[PDB]
Structure 1
């Protein structure tokens, strides 16, 4: 499947794409404002994620650091990134269907739209000013708004027992972005698309 990743933010982001144990395509790339990066993702990919990283410094060899979303210091992400990261998540060709969602479960750093470019389903978006409005205890100094599990490491926020409810913190993400997951057991905002759809991820869609 084809993903076009578009940086509509006025600032540079470093896009990342991974399925947790492997890069998707090149795994990451700098996107200046307006730049678009087209990647190919193998059919059947389960548990892929795309995210933006902010304020990265890399050297010749692709090693460095980002203030949000860093994936072990690599330009080309092999693993997932450090919160806070707004997440585009997808599982492709699962019994004939693609499944996509946006998640604030690992916090929020950049606004995002995640839409099909082919027919038969709708897109989802989380484009509210979650960083500006972020509760004081969840603000990340690097930028971004952490989720409560990252910050506090409790069974309730991390849903470690498989039982947990919404919290003051999850409701904040949910109030600003109803179409994104706000905690592990949120009512699913997953969208079902035809198998083998293609997609566009736009950072800062309303910029």
Structure 2
């Protein structure tokens, strides 16, 4: 499957793509404002994610640091990134269907649209100014708006027992971005698309 990753933000972002134990495609790249990066993701990929990283510095070897979404200091990510990260999440060719969503469970850093480029389902977006409106206790100094599980590390925010409810913090994310997951047991906002669809992820869609 083909994913086009487009940076519409006015600032540089370093896109990342991983399934947690491996890179997807090259795993990461710098995208200046307006640049597009096309990746191929193997059919059957379960648990893939794409995100943006902000304020990164990399040396000639591809080693460095980012202020949001750093994936163990690598340009080319093999693992998932440090919160806060708005996430585009997907599982492809699962019994004939693809499943896509956006998640704020690991916080928010960059606004995002995640849409198919082929026929037969709708896209999802979270484009509100979550960083601007972020509760004081969730604000990340490096930039971004952390989720409450990252900040407070309780069973309730992290839904460790498999039983948890919405919280004042989850409801914040949910109010600004209804179509994204706000906590682990949120009512699913997953979209079912035809198997083998193609997609575009747009940073700063509006």
Q: Do they fold alike, i.e. is TM over 0.5?
A: yes
How far apart in 1 are the matches of 2:181 and 2:151?
17
Note the C-alpha offset of 1:162.
0.1
- Please give the per-residue CA displacement for 1:61-117, whole angstroms capped at 9, x wherever unaligned: 000000000000000000000000000000000000000000000000000000000
Note the C-alpha offset of 1:134.
0.1
How far apart in 1 are the matches of 2:73 and 2:61?
11
- Please give the per-residue CA displacement for 1:12-45, whole angstroms capped at 9, x wherever unaligned: 0000000000000000000000000000000000
How far apart in 2 are the matches of 1:131 and 1:191?
25
Find the counterpart in structure 2 of residue 9 from structure 1. Answer: 9
Q: What are structure 2's unaligned runs of at least 5 residues? A: none
How far apart in 1 are the matches of 2:139 and 2:64?
23
How far apart in 1 are the matches of 2:113 and 2:124?
6
Find the counterpart in structure 1 of residue 188 from structure 2. Answer: 188
Secondary structure class of the residue paired with 1:4: strand
Q: What are structure 1's unaligned runs of at least 5 residues? A: none
Find the counterpart in structure 2 of residue 105 from structure 1. Answer: 105
- Please give the per-residue CA displacement for 1:140-176, whole angstroms capped at 9, x wherever unaligned: 0000000000000000000000000000000000000
How far apart in 2 are the matches of 1:60 and 1:89?
30
How far apart in 2 are the matches of 1:164 and 1:69?
26
Query: Number of aligned pairs?
Result: 206
Secondary structure class of the residue paired with 1:37: strand
- Aligned pairs (5 A) from 1:1-207: 1-206=1-206
How far apart in 2 are the matches of 1:33 and 1:60?
22
Query: What stretches of structure 1 move > 3 A for 4+ residues in a row?
Result: none
Q: Calculate the TM-score normalised by the size of structure 1.
A: 0.99
Note the C-alpha offset of 1:123.
0.1
Secondary structure class of the residue paired with 2:55: strand
How far apart in 2 are the matches of 1:101 and 1:117?
15
Note the C-alpha offset of 1:7.
0.1
How far apart in 1 are the matches of 2:61 and 2:174?
39
Q: Calculate the TM-score normalised by the size of structure 2.
A: 1.00
- In angstroms, what is the RMSD of aligned CA positions? 0.1
